[PDB]
Amino acid sequence: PKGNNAIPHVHQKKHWNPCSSQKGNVKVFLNQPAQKHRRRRLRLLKAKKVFPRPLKALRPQVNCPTVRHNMKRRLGRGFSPAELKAAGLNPQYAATIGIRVDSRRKNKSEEGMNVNVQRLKTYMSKLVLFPMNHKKVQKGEASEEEVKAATQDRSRFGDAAVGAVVYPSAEAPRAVSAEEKSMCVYAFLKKNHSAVRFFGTNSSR
Amino acid sequence: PTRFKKCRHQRGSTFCGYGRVGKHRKHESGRGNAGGMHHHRINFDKYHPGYFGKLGMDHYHRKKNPMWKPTINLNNLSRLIAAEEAAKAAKGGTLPVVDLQSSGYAKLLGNGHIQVPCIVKARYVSKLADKKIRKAGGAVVLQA
RNA sequence: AACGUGUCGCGAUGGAUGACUUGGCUUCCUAUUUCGUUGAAGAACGCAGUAAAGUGCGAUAAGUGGUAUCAAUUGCAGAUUC
RNA sequence: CACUGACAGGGAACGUGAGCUGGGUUUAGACCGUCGUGAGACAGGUUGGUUUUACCCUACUUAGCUGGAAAUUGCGAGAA
RNA sequence: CGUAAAAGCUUGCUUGAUUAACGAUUUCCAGUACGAAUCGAGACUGCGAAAGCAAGGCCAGCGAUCCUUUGCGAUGAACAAAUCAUACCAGAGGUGUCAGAAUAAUUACCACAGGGAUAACUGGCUUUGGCGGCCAA
RNA sequence: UUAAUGAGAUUCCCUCUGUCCCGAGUUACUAUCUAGCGAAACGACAGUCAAGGGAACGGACUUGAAGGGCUAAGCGGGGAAAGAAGACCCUGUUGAGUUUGACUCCAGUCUGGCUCUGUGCGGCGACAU
RNA sequence: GAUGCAUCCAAGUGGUGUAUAUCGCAAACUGAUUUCUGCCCAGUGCUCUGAAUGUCAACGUGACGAGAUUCACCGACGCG
RNA sequence: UAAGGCCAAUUAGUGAAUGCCCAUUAUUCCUUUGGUAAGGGCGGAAACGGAGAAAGUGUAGCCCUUCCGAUGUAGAUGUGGCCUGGAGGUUAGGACGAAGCUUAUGGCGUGAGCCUAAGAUGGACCGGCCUCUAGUGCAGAUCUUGGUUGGCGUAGCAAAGAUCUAACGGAGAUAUACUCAACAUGCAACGUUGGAUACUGGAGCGGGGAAGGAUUUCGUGCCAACGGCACUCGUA
RNA sequence: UCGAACCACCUAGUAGCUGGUUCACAUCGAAGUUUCCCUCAGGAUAGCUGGUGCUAGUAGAAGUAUUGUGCGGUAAAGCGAUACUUUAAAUGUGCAAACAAACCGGCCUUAGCCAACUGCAAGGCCGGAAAGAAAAGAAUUAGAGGCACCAAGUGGGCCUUCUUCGGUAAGCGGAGCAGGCGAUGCGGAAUGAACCGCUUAGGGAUAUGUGGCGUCAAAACUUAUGGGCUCAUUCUCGAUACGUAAAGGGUGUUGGUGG
RNA sequence: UGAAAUGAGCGGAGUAUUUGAGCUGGCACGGGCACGCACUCUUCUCCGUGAUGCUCCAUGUUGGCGAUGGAAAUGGGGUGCCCCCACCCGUCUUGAAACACGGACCAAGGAGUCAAACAGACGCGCAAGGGAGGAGAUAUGGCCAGUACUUCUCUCGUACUGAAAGGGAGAUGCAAAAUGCAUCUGUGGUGUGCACACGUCAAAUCCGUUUGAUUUGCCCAACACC
RNA sequence: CAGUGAGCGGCGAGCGAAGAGGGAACGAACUCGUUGCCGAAUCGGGUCUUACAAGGCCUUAAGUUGUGGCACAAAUAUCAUUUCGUGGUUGGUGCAGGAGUGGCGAAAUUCAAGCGCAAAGCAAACCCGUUGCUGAAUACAACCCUUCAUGUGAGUAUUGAGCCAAAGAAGGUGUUAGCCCAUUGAGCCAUAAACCUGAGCGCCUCAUGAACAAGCGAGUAGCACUGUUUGGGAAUGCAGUGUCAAGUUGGCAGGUAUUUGUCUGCCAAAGUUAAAUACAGAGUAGGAAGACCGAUAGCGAACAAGUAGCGUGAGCGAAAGUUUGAAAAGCACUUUGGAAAGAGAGUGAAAUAGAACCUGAAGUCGUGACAAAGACAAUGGAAGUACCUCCAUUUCAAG
RNA sequence: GCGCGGAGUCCGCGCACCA
């Protein structure tokens, strides 16, 4: 007899199980450790091949969208041409010295642009560019001592010489001000909400 | 493990606990949730009231991110202040500042008695919470 | 008595069990890894001193040439860098 | 209808189908009447339509061999 | 069943056959629903000089989800206006197989899973119809 | 209604006869006995009766009667003998063949519109004017 | 009476009766000859005529509305 | 002169409660098992008849004492309960004989089972204990596959008429212990040639072809199997 | 191979229907009934059963009495017709019988009733009393109360006692109360699921129940120093309940009443 | 068979003790006392052995047989016999020994499994918090498909309610404000209610303490009413 | 995210995704058409340069009904040349090193004790112990006693000494092997092209880097009817037919239809493109494994298995371990028999290992010995007794 | 339920059909 149980919805009514008459529709993960080993091995080989260039190109810092992830930060796809021009860089030349370029992204605020311009300048101050011809060194290219003392940044994100994403600092303790003791903010918040909510009906009349 | 199951205990008992008169047949009641309005009506009505019917307005493309709005109560605020600032805190002096949206909260509710006065920054607040914290000596600052 | 019944010793018929395993099943990996009118895959007929099947091979037919090895092949015959 | 002294009534898985027979009843073919739009129906009529096996046990009928009174043993001894 | 200065008959005035904040309960009963019924609180009223009586005709006379439709007072997610659609609450359109699928025949050309849970034959029980006897008549 | 025809269904007559009264005798091949060869079906265990009670028709139970062992040929009373998951009847939210004035549909057939689609001449309208 | 009737095929400049042409071809019923084959058109079928507006579909025409719409008019076989 | 039917006794007008027989019941004694079980002991007294003495659900139960219950289909649950293949640990065995197999081989256990003995058996692997794991226990499914078996030396091997005789051939005979001339102690059956007797009866057990078959054709050998009897013969 | 051929595949098609389902001991132990269902050979649901517990171990106990206090219209009785009813049992059935209860006097509070409150209603606080329930037949208990969670089988019954409805009757159909068998042997009735006795760990002794004591067959080796009655010739005197013969006759024999 | 013999029964001490029957001197019993209540015959009496022993086992008399063997004895195993007892297994069914179905013999094979969602009970870790997964990093480059390490995220929970626009829970005191004021070591109250503390009562006790009942305080868990 | 407080659904059974967040990958980007400026500067074919050169010379052959160049959101603009350099992916000639591939390539006992029974033990954690010590097999061989005989395959086993290990890691060898054999490193040698190396390094030819004003893809998008598909709901994608645009003042998308204003993102109707992902009955060349199966199992197939065999055909489809022994040493020879075989003899540790030959169960059958026994079917329970017993245990003298 | 007629009622006709 059924007693007091949850009403089941287990969704297993298609031919998913392989048997004598059905091929099935199934996916197992029995190759997971072998694939992990293979990916790490390929990464180390690729680093050795591209030595001394860093394994990963330089990327900008962006803000996450929506009101739920508003306060977070991460790495985006590439630098915008406006940031690159503020840093003094032809995008087509920046593509050849390990900088990612994204022409779709816009800059709607100043602070987001300033952060990425600083990232670009910090990177450019630490670049060590090798000469095309060992005979002749033209303009800002490394001498032979640096080619001797060249190293590879193998970090997982390519942030060795720019650092990780930065965050807004934390407010220090302070005292409560007179107006803060005086009047509440609840009424102000409700007034703004009601103004927007009943806009239109308050204006037609 | 197979050695702990009831089949091991039933070896030698020909019927395996299903009886001689009524047997262990295939599907004597129908399959799944069949019969919920006809021959399983009593079970459905006694254990799952409300199961059949419609209610309310529709909302075709629901996104949960714009509705994100977690809450925290006044008598739980000490979960967000490190133990060194909490003891130093005192009404009429210097108070720790709590940023709710960085700890994962959007609204401050006013249940209970506040234990450590502080300055709280929040997107939303209830009226009783605002009154209580002002009386205890802190403040609320609206943020976005 | 005879036929029949029962028990023990020894034999026959029969091919179970145990031990054995160059086979199966299942999982994972590595590549200058993907056939054919320049006639493929498949199908047929043949080839050894002795040769039914199977294996290999095509009238140059249980194999020609090259490189590396280093004294066999083997049921019976036959004949060192050849 | 006729004979006789007389042509009483019943039971035995309504005795008796590996005893028979197969006329009736009860498949498929076909005709008639009535009924049904119709496919078809009829406790109505009609004609045509495979009847399998005993060498086993018992019973019965006949036909042979042979032990045995402590009814096979005890030496356990009873004479119309 | 009950009822006599009435619960019957005649008569005067009336609409308590309305509304009734999701109050509690009985019958069926799993102590679920539906139908019917009992005791109430609030509004607005009727009749009566008054105390009072009355939210139908005591007790059978009725109906889920979804859908349609009417009465009453938030939404259409980037904003705004007017239409249109939808939503909360209360009714109405129906399921008589009445706790609610949308449903005609035939098989002797026939099939399958089962049933002695169930007919057609013997047997058993009981009666039948047979059938004349025994006292008196 | 019908001459001729019929391995069609029916009744009577003549001839004839072992169909019968009522059975008897004979032949060939079997059965029977021998040499050689050599199966199957079936097989819970078994296998003498009377009465009783019992799932109301016992080989096995109760009370009585019989019953020495082993064999050959026959036989069809019993073994509710063998043969096949009853073709009759009922049940199942099981089929299939067939029918229709059953529910829901699809081809086919007919009918209208648009399209394929051009050039002139008249006539009748309707919208402007 | 071939611009046909019956009719195959998923389809086409596709197929069959048709190498044909009413003394032909296709679809039904009855069942030699002889002698005959009555009455019934109400029902159900089949078939023939119009009322251009009895009824209806798409299309088409006019009006209302900011518009999605709404209303009206027209409308063939068939049915009656 | 009941061993029948009604009534009434208990060894009989003698003088004082029970004539006799038979239960898985009653009373009582011994042992097991389980409890909503009930008590006690467990700092080794000392010395030197025997040993032991665990703070404990469950054992070969830590040890004593005490009281009460015990059957059961469908069904539930427990078990330091039994058994099988493999893994992690630990501890052992084996050519002076492992696994497997055999039994009037006893011993232990209420039981599932465990252990020893003997092999006039075998010839290379394997046992106990704690954890882990599963394709883990059979009497029956008109169950599956292999092999046996009564019936049984039985039913039968009965259409197409049929063979006989001598010589030769062949291991297929004329095959013997005393005694015995020969019968009564080697039967039955075969190929070839000659002779006899019959059959097919020209719509033929005659002579040639198609379809189908594919060496069955010819000669020399051979006789294990096959030619439902037989063979010295054969389409083997 | 045909009222829809054959081959392979979807396909291990579905089956409320038939058949099967492999070791031991131990502690417990049912149901064939309720409500709803295209529901009658099936389910869900409550009940009956097992497991796990929780809680302050005698508590809010009872298939039973006694005393007090309520309910009833059947049997019997009587007279519509020519059984309806005043009356009215036996057997039943509801409540109470001193520890969260009830009794006697302060006081607080209520926007409860009343013309009003020093009355009444309700909730509390402070005190008193307490054969802790006498005597009069004046209870008893192998008498620890309450509260949850998880889940099985079952939903074909049948027999008997006393009531009965249908039916001519039935080893027939349908019901009420209780006990049984099913699920269970053992001892008796010669035999029998259900009758009588008794209900079950493995064994002794003693004594009994039902039933017996001529033999079969244990017991009066055919008891008594008890009384009556009975003769029966082809199924036949008779003799263990449940269980398988009537009217009418008889000088056969034994007695009783009145004449 | 006396390895703690508890005895009216084995031991020590004397001769008396006190049970009845007859017969004896206020109240009761009846209309006197058959002899109720109170103060010669007939029998044996008093005293004694604790466990420095928690448990188990070890102790008489007289014969037969057995002096090392083809021994004796006890138990087990096998086969026959006698007296008694005793219907064929599995299954469906109210009911099977059935004239109800399956059942010739043996070997080997043969049936509640794996996955996923939820729940209850029991074991383990942490706790207002718990825990990943995917992936990376370096020990690490048959051992090594294991083990050791990791962020910031995600998920379940710490808060619910409304169809929705939305809103969102402490206590006490003053007070009555349609966002009142003041304090912050705290069960919102009432009834029932472990343990502990404070006293009482009854029973037993080398007798210092137990075993029960009960008053008062606080009442934990929990239940009932607000 | 999410079996979803989305949504679809006789709103029943059931079905059911997307954006955001942590990550894998990532040198990731480019080409036509159109517009403007040029206008054969292009392509094929001969022929010559070491060359079917991205090179010269010649070609009406193709092509103006348009091949090709330059610029355009990562842009700043058209040309203008000669300077220094660059290009191993212009073509022709050469030259290296590496990786890969193939061959070659390591240690330590056949150490000492001898045969049925000491090539075996005891000395109680460790140490004594390099030490001590010692024989219950004077064996056993089928009712019991005497005589004669016969009976142990190969040491990877035991015991005692000793070595190797950067190698203890499995396989082979007549019983169980670190040291009997193979295998395992360090290292050495040899290679057609291709692959990697200051985009390896020279020449000849051939290319070429830096200073010095308009427009943007038409029977397309949309709309109507019908059909289908989706979670997509007054219509998520698509198909047929009818109808059929706009001009960046424009168009498409913003999950409820219409009309009207705003706002945000993007620019369809042409094309190419590595990696991270699949291999659910593929294949080539190599490798590594397993708490899996163990000859009725595991693939149908451990074997001359998709074989033998069956069906007109499509198709269907087995059984069967060759496992004698360490080695064929595979039974010479005598004797009986027509032969098959039998009786002896011999090999071997073993012939009851004699060729489909390890072990060799159950069931069924033959034979020898014994026990009995009526018809009571047989089997079965309980309690004794007669006879037997290759079984166990206990007792034998003061007990 | 929608349109026509003929005497909100009825009568015919032809159409429509998700509680």
Ligand SMILES: [K+]
């Ligand atoms: K015969």
Ligand SMILES: [Mg+2]
């Ligand atoms: Mg239940």
Ligand SMILES: [Mg+2]
């Ligand atoms: Mg298949």
Ligand SMILES: [Mg+2]
């Ligand atoms: Mg059971």
Ligand SMILES: [Mg+2]
């Ligand atoms: Mg069931």
Ligand SMILES: [Mg+2]
């Ligand atoms: Mg049932």
Ligand SMILES: [Mg+2]
């Ligand atoms: Mg709605």
Ligand SMILES: [Mg+2]
């Ligand atoms: Mg084997």
Ligand SMILES: [Mg+2]
């Ligand atoms: Mg390919």
Ligand SMILES: [Mg+2]
């Ligand atoms: Mg060959």
Ligand SMILES: [Mg+2]
């Ligand atoms: Mg050639």
Ligand SMILES: [Mg+2]
């Ligand atoms: Mg009122």
Ligand SMILES: [Mg+2]
């Ligand atoms: Mg609707």
Ligand SMILES: [Mg+2]
């Ligand atoms: Mg019946």
Ligand SMILES: [Mg+2]
């Ligand atoms: Mg017969």
Ligand SMILES: [Mg+2]
């Ligand atoms: Mg016969």
